[PDB]
Amino acid sequence: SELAGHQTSAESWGTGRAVARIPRVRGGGTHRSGQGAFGNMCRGGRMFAPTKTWRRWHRRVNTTQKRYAICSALAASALPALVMSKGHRIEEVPELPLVVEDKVEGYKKTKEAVLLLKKLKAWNDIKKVYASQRMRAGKGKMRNRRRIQRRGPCVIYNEDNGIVKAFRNIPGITLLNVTKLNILKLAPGGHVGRFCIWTESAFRKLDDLYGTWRKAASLKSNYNLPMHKMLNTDLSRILKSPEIQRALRAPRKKIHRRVLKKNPL
Amino acid sequence: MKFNPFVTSDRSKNRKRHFNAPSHIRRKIMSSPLSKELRQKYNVRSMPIRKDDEVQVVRGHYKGQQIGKVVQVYRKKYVIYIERVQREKANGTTVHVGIHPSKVVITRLKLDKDRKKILERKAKSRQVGKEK
RNA sequence: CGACUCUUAGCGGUGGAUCACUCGGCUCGUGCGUCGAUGAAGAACGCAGCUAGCUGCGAGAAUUAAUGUGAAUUGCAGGUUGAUCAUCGACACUUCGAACGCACUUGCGGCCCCGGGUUCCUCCCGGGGCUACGCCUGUCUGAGCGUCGCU
RNA sequence: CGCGGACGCUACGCCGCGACGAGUAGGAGGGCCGCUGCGGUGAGCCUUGAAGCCUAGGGCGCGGGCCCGGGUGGAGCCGCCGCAGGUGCAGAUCUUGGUGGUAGUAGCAAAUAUUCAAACGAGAACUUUGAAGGCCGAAGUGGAGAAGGGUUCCAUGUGAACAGCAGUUGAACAUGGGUCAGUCGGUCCUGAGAGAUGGGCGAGCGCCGUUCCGAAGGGACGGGCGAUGGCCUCCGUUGCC
RNA sequence: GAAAGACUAAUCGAACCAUCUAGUAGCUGGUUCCCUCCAAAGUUUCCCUCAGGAUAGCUGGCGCUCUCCG
RNA sequence: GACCCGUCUUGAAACACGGACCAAGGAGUCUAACACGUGCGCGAGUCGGGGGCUACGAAAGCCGCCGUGGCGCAAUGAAGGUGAAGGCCGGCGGCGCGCCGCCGGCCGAGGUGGGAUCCCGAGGCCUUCCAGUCCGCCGAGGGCGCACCACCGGCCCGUCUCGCCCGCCGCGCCGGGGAGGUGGAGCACGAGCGCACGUGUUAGGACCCGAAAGAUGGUGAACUAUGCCUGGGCA
RNA sequence: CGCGACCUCAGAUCAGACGUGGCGACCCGCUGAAUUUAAGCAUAUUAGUCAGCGGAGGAAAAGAAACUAACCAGGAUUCCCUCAGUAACGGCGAGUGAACAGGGAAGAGCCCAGCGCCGAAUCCCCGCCCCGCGGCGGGGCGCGGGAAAUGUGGCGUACGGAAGACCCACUCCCCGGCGCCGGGGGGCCCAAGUCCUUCUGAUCGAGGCCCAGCCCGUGGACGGUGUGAGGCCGGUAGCGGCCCCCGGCGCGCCGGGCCCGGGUCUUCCCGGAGUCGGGUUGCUUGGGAAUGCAGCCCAAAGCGGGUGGUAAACUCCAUCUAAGGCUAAAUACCGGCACGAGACCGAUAGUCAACAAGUACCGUAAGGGAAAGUUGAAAAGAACUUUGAAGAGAGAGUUCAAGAGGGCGUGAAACCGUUAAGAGGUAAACGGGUGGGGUCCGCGCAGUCCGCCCGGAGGAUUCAACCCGGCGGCGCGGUCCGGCCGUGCCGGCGGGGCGGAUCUCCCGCUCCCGUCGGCGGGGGACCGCCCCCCGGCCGGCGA
Ligand SMILES: [Mg+2]
Ligand SMILES: [Mg+2]
Ligand SMILES: [Mg+2]
Ligand SMILES: [Mg+2]
Ligand SMILES: [Mg+2]
Ligand SMILES: [Mg+2]
Ligand SMILES: [Mg+2]
Ligand SMILES: [Mg+2]
Ligand SMILES: [Mg+2]
Ligand SMILES: [Mg+2]
Ligand SMILES: [Mg+2]
Ligand SMILES: [Mg+2]
Ligand SMILES: [Mg+2]
Ligand SMILES: [Mg+2]
Ligand SMILES: [Mg+2]
Ligand SMILES: [Mg+2]
Ligand SMILES: [Mg+2]
Ligand SMILES: [Mg+2]
Ligand SMILES: [Mg+2]
Ligand SMILES: [Mg+2]
Ligand SMILES: [Mg+2]
Ligand SMILES: [Mg+2]
Ligand SMILES: [Mg+2]
Ligand SMILES: [Mg+2]
Ligand SMILES: [Mg+2]
Ligand SMILES: [Mg+2]
Ligand SMILES: [Mg+2]
Ligand SMILES: [Mg+2]
Ligand SMILES: [Mg+2]
Ligand SMILES: [Mg+2]
Ligand SMILES: [Mg+2]
Ligand SMILES: [Mg+2]
Ligand SMILES: [Mg+2]
Ligand SMILES: [Mg+2]
Ligand SMILES: [Mg+2]
Ligand SMILES: [Mg+2]
Ligand SMILES: [Mg+2]
Ligand SMILES: [Mg+2]
Ligand SMILES: [Mg+2]
Ligand SMILES: [Mg+2]
Ligand SMILES: [Mg+2]
Ligand SMILES: [Mg+2]
Ligand SMILES: [Mg+2]
Ligand SMILES: [Mg+2]
Ligand SMILES: [Mg+2]
Ligand SMILES: [Mg+2]
Ligand SMILES: [Mg+2]
Ligand SMILES: [Mg+2]
Ligand SMILES: [Mg+2]
Ligand SMILES: [Mg+2]
Ligand SMILES: [Mg+2]
Ligand SMILES: [Mg+2]
Ligand SMILES: [Mg+2]
Ligand SMILES: [Mg+2]
Ligand SMILES: [Mg+2]
Ligand SMILES: [Mg+2]
Ligand SMILES: [Mg+2]
Ligand SMILES: [Mg+2]
Ligand SMILES: [Mg+2]
Ligand SMILES: [Mg+2]
Ligand SMILES: [Mg+2]
Ligand SMILES: [Mg+2]
Ligand SMILES: [Mg+2]
Ligand SMILES: [Mg+2]
Ligand SMILES: [Mg+2]
Ligand SMILES: [Mg+2]
Ligand SMILES: [Mg+2]
Ligand SMILES: [Mg+2]
Ligand SMILES: [Mg+2]
Ligand SMILES: [Mg+2]
Ligand SMILES: [Mg+2]
Ligand SMILES: [Mg+2]
Ligand SMILES: [Mg+2]
Ligand SMILES: [Mg+2]
Ligand SMILES: [Mg+2]
Ligand SMILES: [Mg+2]
Ligand SMILES: [Mg+2]
Ligand SMILES: [Mg+2]
Ligand SMILES: [Mg+2]
Ligand SMILES: [Mg+2]
Ligand SMILES: [Mg+2]
Ligand SMILES: [Mg+2]
Ligand SMILES: [Mg+2]
């Protein structure tokens, strides 16, 4: 507030009186009568730079970088190494772009959709969520940030036929929509590779929403995909190729250590 | 999760409406579960407690399989007093021991006209959801 | 062999830092947007069986009626035809205060009307009702050779 | 014929050769140094004992600092890749608290003065009674009041607090008690002066002003009418003229 | 104010209380963790300028075109 | 061996100042703008910041006949205003072969000096002595020559000097054209826009503490200063 | 000197009505400074700002043109982006600083006076009765009384209007007392383990329940309970249920009210006055030979008047009607009651204040204004004995714990007390270097291990090789048959979608003497890219 520290009335005692030329409290017969009122170093009194509300809180980022981050977060939810190293339990899942039929939008019982994540062998992740329900450290306990947990697998559908009431209870499971995708729940924390469970009617829509290189997006205005910068990224099948190992000089890998000086006399 | 936006999920606005709650809601907060003997017959799960009921004790130091009787409810400390749960001071007088009512199972009730109106409604609007 | 003085450790004192908690505050946001001459805001004095304080109320004074709930309140004594806790729509609301009979000592009165010592006849006590300034439409009563003319 | 050949290379890595190194104000870079908090993650640790303190215990780092064992303690905490900040103290006659030296010292010296015996008592250089010896010496260290204070006045108990030593004593504490009017005073009149209405100014809350630019008499008086009733005799009580 | 610049709630060669207010200062004091590398000036012109700032100088940082003729 | 630490100072152990002692708290922060470095996307274009449409979520996603608008692509003059090569060739006009001028065929966006890389490639790189393919190499000299720097020319606007021809619904104080020096923040085959971080200068309380004063609006004559009313006292 | 009447004007404790003071976050009207900046300072700036004064509301003000622009022209006010830190002002120094157009939120418009016509066609109050009446109203009656010709009502207002003709058209409109059909506040109500062995002072913790993975899961947010809980209680979820109350709006009638409109032609009428404007003085604004406002004197006009950003005359065009009025939404909100959340602070912080805080306490006053959180799960808050006049002790006793004792969690340093050790004449303290003495660790006190051969003794369920069964890898097979793909392609009788500043018979309108012709709503073909089934080349199959 603007009133911190200034709802007193003070004036220094001047020189003499063996004091420090500080604003002091105008008289009275109590304890707080000549104690030190204004300034920052006093008991009571204001802080340094009373923080104002018009600090620039928000930021904006361009459009075509928001869409480049979505294409660069979808392209790494397909490798079984950037998902295992993120931390999930994906040792047994039979196919990484996991596409399931359109009759999951007709589920309405979470009892009917655990038998689904058991058949899909994804329950050991939810088991890791039950094995990681713990508290929080610090002053978050008195600000309604009590219990934390660990982010689980995502689920992407096409249309809402009843699935939300049948998944929103299992902790970890984060729902989406293709038409209204999000990054903050695809890249948790700033890191890449959250496990995802696609549906058929959506995974057959990304070709229309984002478009190939020789065909633009038809539900956007004007947008093609970005261009790579180099193709054969694997320089282990480049360098030991017959076109390059021939046109080099000899490799000089002999160590040539310093010699001691002996006296020639 | 809760979706109603006029109900507070805070900690302090739930501790305050508990330590400064009036007596006619202290009535509802101080209830206790019924035994599986009564749960079989009435098809009920919990009732508020009255001065002249019958009680076993499940948890605490004095737990066992004994049937005591309620002496007097003390709804200022959210606590009651039972017949034979007492202990000795220095000189020898017996002082009762406070037990919170959630640790307490009921085996017999104190039935009235104002109690069977309730108990037949907490199974009428119990079965409507069964009719789902 | 001591005493004093300095040094470090163990124990004990003075002191209330640190750690951990929180019925409090700060900022933003939503919906509403309501006082008083039918006596407001504010202040003063009173009220509990044992009571000082804040808090709750107004000679019906830590609350009455009604409805809703349906067995306690509590530091100690007491004594289901509805206790106690809530809501509040029917009753009541002491003295100052824009303050209103004239004053600020709570002091001096007046006009009606009932009860009593009495026997409207004056005074005598008690009880109730009225007696502020400013202005509006009306009713009543009046002034004016400056009006203005008739009778 | 035989089925045999070390280490390495987190490429922001590893290895080798040369010359050099001072440094205030000031500039830059690296910080696996550190504090409080948020997104992520460690199938982390924790009442078979977490934070925090203590330590003649054992060690590492150039250093900032961290880690371990041994004691107390009793319920929540840390590491890594990233984000944000009210983020690191010896001083400012710094601010708020708290304790020493000086110190058992300065000091308890204005107005002439105290002794003896007894009683209650755990206890008496001061308390009460008596016995002397002295002072104020009628413009008093005496008897009563106004201004001010507000329960100090009175009694019975208390002794941990206060009465700058003590205390059986107290203007201290705790329980209770107390202030009686036709004649004493307030009330009632005016004084120097304050202050409304009519009226004047003034953007305005309001201001000058007090007989001055005002239709300022609400009352008695004597007589006549209409009224009423009081034992309507004698009259009251009202209205008008 | 029978006058001295006296007194006006311990305050007078213009009282006290709150607000604009955290008033201005070329002027005094203080300015909070480690290591590594480089390293100075107190001279110039102009200023109601001489306790001060502008300017050139000295210094550090980031790079660049070539060499591996000047 | 060795004076006590902080601080202004040409010069501190100083007979210069602040400092008795311990714990906690304590001083370059926050917006707007601009300049330059640096990281990212799109690219002669870029940007939806304001507006709309569909618990975390007050978030995210879209809209192109919602791209209006901002900066940029084009400068100069006080302004009215103007607004960025030309070479060669045909028959050709007068005159004095040349200019200028009405018409046709081709051509064409400069020049010299340095210039990293590039190309041609005289000559040879053995293993019993002579032919000969490829692969690069080596390589004297010789060629195209990026980026840039210096210089010469040319073009555009403003302004002065010398002087000639052409145009026309309006025939004039009309309009247009050339050569030569001078002024310009300009062209000469683009380089910007939006976001995030860093230092630096500034405007705001602006590294924190510090004055002597200045103004508006209000409270006091219970002490003391003087006039008044009413009473009281001086062997 | 009379009775009389309109006018001007008083009094009343006359009847019935009204306003006055407070809050002051946002608002409208006036009044209005100085610190400060310019390196001084006086015009400027600080500022139409604080303070001061008067008025309201749930929102206030503004407002249907005496308007902008010179275009092929827009068309009430407010509000956001933009123009713009720009045209301009200014010791032309420091510095201040607008609007129009364009895209958007919201969208709503109107009435009187005058001019004239209808026989005051007009209100308010008193009286009686009936209905309803916790917002005092309607209909019937009043030889019952009052105001208005110094003008009450109807039509009617600048988009033109009225009137009288002649033609064309008319069948709903508004409330008020009700009956009746299906947004809001309060109340009470709604899932599932205290299952096994065990740790503990007490479990919510550790483990277990498979071949339905303990149970419900449209409910795993949170809170209470003797540490930590989806399943112990309360609670959350759900177009879940029930019980009350007040409305919004729909339909039946029963009542009263109001008889109204077009088009086409003839004749009439038509607007606000000490104000506009002019001179002047003073404040002001970006407004500059003077934008607005205010004061003094002068003071108008009807083919008129003001404006048309440089003063002045003569001219032409354009656009508007001053001096009188009303009006919802879009916008603002540190106060107020009622609510949710938070990359915030966590008792010297955060509001001054977590607690008997604007309280104690100082000053005559105006005014100034603090310090102060925490036993334990439960007071089970220490019976009794004993010394002492008592305070305070000594044993005992409660709890897991007095090493938690009524200002009681944790218990830091300065500082003091006592114990143990080691010392002591140049104030103590430090640095470099050893030496001695102590505390401690070595869980030291007969000190390596791993490979490989020779030798010594032992024992297995024991090797090499073949035989079947299963998996996996390379395949240059100099080239096994199949596959999909191509930021690879050629031709096609293909079967199709997006675009286009490439081209031109139909629908329509306007124009033309059913015909032309500009303008378009449409076809249809021509291209380019993309998709799609059949056909061919090369190709990888190490994203
Ligand atoms: Mg504070
Ligand atoms: Mg912590
Ligand atoms: Mg709900
Ligand atoms: Mg009492
Ligand atoms: Mg009742
Ligand atoms: Mg008096
Ligand atoms: Mg060095
Ligand atoms: Mg030590
Ligand atoms: Mg605890
Ligand atoms: Mg310190
Ligand atoms: Mg002495
Ligand atoms: Mg004497
Ligand atoms: Mg006396
Ligand atoms: Mg006396
Ligand atoms: Mg006494
Ligand atoms: Mg008297
Ligand atoms: Mg006066
Ligand atoms: Mg005198
Ligand atoms: Mg003098
Ligand atoms: Mg002065
Ligand atoms: Mg400051
Ligand atoms: Mg100051
Ligand atoms: Mg350098
Ligand atoms: Mg000069
Ligand atoms: Mg100076
Ligand atoms: Mg300087
Ligand atoms: Mg020496
Ligand atoms: Mg100094
Ligand atoms: Mg100096
Ligand atoms: Mg000197
Ligand atoms: Mg120096
Ligand atoms: Mg020094
Ligand atoms: Mg000095
Ligand atoms: Mg000193
Ligand atoms: Mg600190
Ligand atoms: Mg840049
Ligand atoms: Mg600069
Ligand atoms: Mg600064
Ligand atoms: Mg001055
Ligand atoms: Mg006096
Ligand atoms: Mg005098
Ligand atoms: Mg009256
Ligand atoms: Mg002024
Ligand atoms: Mg100045
Ligand atoms: Mg200055
Ligand atoms: Mg000055
Ligand atoms: Mg201004
Ligand atoms: Mg001014
Ligand atoms: Mg002003
Ligand atoms: Mg103001
Ligand atoms: Mg008012
Ligand atoms: Mg109101
Ligand atoms: Mg309005
Ligand atoms: Mg209006
Ligand atoms: Mg108009
Ligand atoms: Mg306009
Ligand atoms: Mg601009
Ligand atoms: Mg100048
Ligand atoms: Mg506009
Ligand atoms: Mg709209
Ligand atoms: Mg009308
Ligand atoms: Mg009219
Ligand atoms: Mg339940
Ligand atoms: Mg719990
Ligand atoms: Mg605990
Ligand atoms: Mg729980
Ligand atoms: Mg469980
Ligand atoms: Mg001005
Ligand atoms: Mg005016
Ligand atoms: Mg002009
Ligand atoms: Mg003209
Ligand atoms: Mg008007
Ligand atoms: Mg929310
Ligand atoms: Mg913080
Ligand atoms: Mg504190
Ligand atoms: Mg505090
Ligand atoms: Mg603390
Ligand atoms: Mg405390
Ligand atoms: Mg505590
Ligand atoms: Mg313990
Ligand atoms: Mg303690
Ligand atoms: Mg000791
Ligand atoms: Mg010793």
Curated annotation (Swiss-Prot), chain A:
Portion of the full-length sequence here: 55 to 319 of 413
Citrulline PTM sites in chain numbering: R246
Disulfide bonds: none
Species this protein is from: Oryctolagus cuniculus
Keywords: Acetylation, Citrullination, Cytoplasm, Isopeptide bond, Methylation, Phosphoprotein, Ribonucleoprotein, Ribosomal protein, Ubl conjugation
Modified residues (Omega-N-methylarginine): R43
UniProt-recorded name of the protein: Large ribosomal subunit protein uL4
Membership in a protein family: Belongs to the universal ribosomal protein uL4 family.
Any GO MF annotation of the entry: structural constituent of ribosome
Crosslink (Glycyl lysine isopeptide (Lys-Gly) (interchain with G-Cter in SUMO2)) position: K185
Curated annotation (Swiss-Prot), chain B:
Main location: cytoplasm
One GO term of the biological process aspect: translation
Protein localization: Cytoplasm
Cellular component per GO, a single term: large ribosomal subunit
An MF annotation (GO) of this entry: RNA binding
Sequence segments annotated as region (Disordered): 1-21
NCBIfam families found in the cross-reference section: rplX_A_E
Protein name as it appears in the record: Large ribosomal subunit protein uL24
Organism: Oryctolagus cuniculus
